[PDB]
Amino acid sequence: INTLWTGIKPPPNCQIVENTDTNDGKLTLVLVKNGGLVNGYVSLVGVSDTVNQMFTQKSATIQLRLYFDSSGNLLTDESNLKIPLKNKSSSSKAFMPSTTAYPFNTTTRDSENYIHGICYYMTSYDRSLVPLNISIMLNSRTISSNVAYAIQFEWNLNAKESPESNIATLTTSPFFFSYIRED
C-alpha cells in the first residue's frame, strides 16, 4: 500500500481551460510513500484542440489545482483533476503534503511551499526540446472549509518564438519530485 495514482494511461481526467464542458487533458500522477517522503512523478498530455494550440504562441501557462479533504480524498468539484486518485492494488492521508512542513499561509510570504524545476516539450516538426518551467505549490492557499491539503502544478512556456505554428499534441516530459509527507 505504497502508491496513490491516476492509473496508467488514463482517459481524459482534468480540465485545463477556464470554462470547458469536457475534460481536455490526461494527467499522469504517481505518488509513492518512501519513508518520511513522498516520491512523485507527473506528466500531462493535451486532449482538446484548444489545449493543443496553446503552444502556437510564444508564452503559455497551464495550472492544475488539486484539493483534498481531511481523509486525503480528492475534492472533485473544486479541483482541476476530475477523477479521484486510487491505490495501485485496491485514508490516503499518509500521501498528503505535511501541513507542518508546508503550512497554509495568512500572508503572501509562501516561498517555502514551492518546488521548482524544468521539464521539456518535444516539437512536432524537427523534434527540438523546449524548456517548460514547472512549479509545484504545496498547501499554502485554501478556497473552502472542506480543504485540508492541496497540490498545485503549474507549467509555463516562455520562449522567444512559438514551439508550433499549428495544432499538435501537447505533452510534458515526466517531472520528478519529493516532499515531506503527512503523519
**183 touches its own copies by CB under 8 A:** no
Contact of residue 73 among Na ion, its own copies, none (CB under 5-8 Å per partner type)? Na ion
**43 touches its own copies by CB under 8 A:** yes
Stretch near its own copies under the rule CB under 8 A, chosen from 15-23, 53-61, 78-86, 111-119: 111-119
Closest alpha carbon to 120 in 72, 165, 170: 170
**What share of residues in the chain are helix, strand, coil (percent, to 5)?**
5, 45, 50
Neighbours of 137 (CB within 10 A): 20
| Lookup: cell for 36 | 518520511
Q: From CA 136, how far away is CA 134, in angstroms rounded?
A: 7
For its own copies, the binding residues (CB under 8 A) are 2-3, 5, 8-9, 28, 30, 32-37, 39, 41, 43, 45, 88, 98, 100-101, 109, 111-112, 114-116, 118-120, 122, 129, 133, 169, 171, 173-174, 176-180
